[PDB]
Design a protein around this ligand. Structure first.
Ligand code: R9V
Length: 330
């Protein structure tokens, strides 16, 4: 089997991407944030505290003929940005892009933090990191990808995120029309439950490539590119007037600037992030200070290849017995 679903930016900045997901019988379609940095499929629901729902579409298990309470199971998750959610668990039929899993754990939110209530466009998350990170207790649950394995033609999914445009998540096949050149594969460590890999270095604009190992994760659920302070300082030193602002919480730059590209290494291959991808616009409406898309990972404890980096590439998440990542230009 395969599946193919379109993913759409939630706003003009590509802050996140939503993908329609069918849950239950008859189908209830919710728009989920596919997150390769977490392992829970959780939704706004009929159980979510009413004052914490503002515009989201909810999953109502009582209206699904295939929903069953997963008796005793609870979940609670905290993300890298300080956001959180928790609740109870149902199993139900979940379909993405024509690919169906029966008996998927659907984690029903009873509580969500402010960042979720305040985002009407995101109805929940669909985690695509390794199932070892799933938070359900006392019986840990599998991701949608882990459950779909074995029906897939090839044990893979691909992320093809758009710049200010829709893109695609595919399950079970490589679309050889979706990228240019060849795919470069690189080793993955699953020790922390992430799609963790080691970039071979970087370049700023037209500058020379610096060969240096940068461990980090491929995380579709993180907006920005978070890299070591040395690398990030080297990038922003090429933008006149750029500075790190403690008040704003990262590097800002004059909105009148033209940003240089940023290149990262994948083995002997190179992925080039155009400068325009690194512009996240005014820090507040009407400001001439713009927020940078490359930020320091110091304090976060891991480097994160988030959407800024991933949307410059066609990315293969290879879930074979020995997982690997692949990157191609597009
Ligand atoms: O206050 C809420 C949380 C954030 C910041 C503004 C708006 C509502 N959300 C945009 C956003 C969504 C997904 C990822 C990154 C940013």
């Amino acid at each position: 089997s395969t599946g193919s679903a379109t993913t759409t930016p939630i706003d003009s900045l590509d802050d996140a991407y939503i993908t329609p997901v069918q849950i239950g019988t008859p189908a209830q379609t919710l728009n989920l944030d596919f997150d390769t940095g977490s392992s829970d499929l959780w939704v706004f629901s009929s159980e979510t505290t009413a004052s914490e729902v503002d515009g989201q579409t909810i999953y109502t298990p009582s209206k699904s003929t295939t929903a069953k309470l997963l008796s005793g199971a609870t979940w609670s998750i905290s993300y890298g940005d300080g956001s959180s959610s928790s609740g109870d668990v149902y199993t139900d039929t979940v379909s993405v892009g024509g690919l169906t899993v029966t008996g998927q754990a659907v984690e029903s939110a009873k509580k969500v933090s402010s960042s979720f209530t305040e985002d009407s466009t995101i109805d929940g998350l669909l985690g695509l990191a390794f199932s070892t990170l799933n938070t359900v207790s006392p019986t840990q649950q599998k991701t949608f990808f882990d459950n779909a394995k074995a029906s897939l033609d090839s044990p893979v999914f691909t992320a093809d995120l758009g710049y200010h445009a829709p893109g695609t998540y595919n399950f079970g096949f490589i679309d050889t029309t979706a990228y240019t050149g060849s795919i470069t594969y690189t080793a993955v460590s699953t020790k922390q439950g992430f799609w963790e890999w080691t970039s071979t270095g970087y370049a700023v604009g037209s500058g020379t490539f610096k060969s240096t190992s940068i461990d980090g994760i491929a995380d579709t659920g993180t907006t920005l590119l978070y890299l070591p302070a040395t690398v990030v300082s080297a990038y922003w030193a090429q933008v006149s007037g750029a500075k790190s602002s403690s008040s704003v919480g990262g590097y800002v730059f004059p909105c009148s600037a033209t940003l240089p590209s940023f290149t990262f290494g994948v083995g002997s291959a190179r992925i080039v992030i155009p400068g325009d991808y690194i512009d996240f616009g005014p820090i507040s409406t009407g400001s001439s200070s713009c927020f940078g898309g490359i930020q320091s990972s110091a304090g976060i404890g891991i480097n994160i290849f988030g959407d800024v980096a991933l949307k410059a590439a066609f990315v293969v998440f290879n879930g074979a017995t020995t997982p690997t990542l692949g990157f191609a230009s597009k």
